[PDB]
Amino acid sequence: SMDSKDLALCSMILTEMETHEDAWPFLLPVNLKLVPGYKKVIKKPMDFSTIREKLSSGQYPNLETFALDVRLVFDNCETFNEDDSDIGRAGHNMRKYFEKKWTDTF
């Protein structure tokens, strides 16, 4: 129940984020089997391809719900990883990019 225009703009932000050089940790779900410990720290895993699926299948009724899942990607990364790492910096850079891109779009 996002209209055509909102669906379109969220889809563009997701593609822009997918293209960004700091997007590499977030493209696909964390593999719970080879990151033992992940799931005991992280209550709800989330990544961009799951967001894409949920967007394409009508699971986001409005703009806020979509933004909520995007933030959860970067909150998960910050909870799990040291800030002083390539992955930690990647998360902080993508959050900054997203929030600016969100403000400028809406």
Binding site: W24, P25, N31, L34, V35, G37, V41, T79, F80, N81, E82, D84, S85, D86, I87, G88
Partner: peptide, 8 residues
Amino acid sequence: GGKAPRKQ
């Protein structure tokens, strides 16, 4: 895989 866990 690219991870830098705070714990462990």
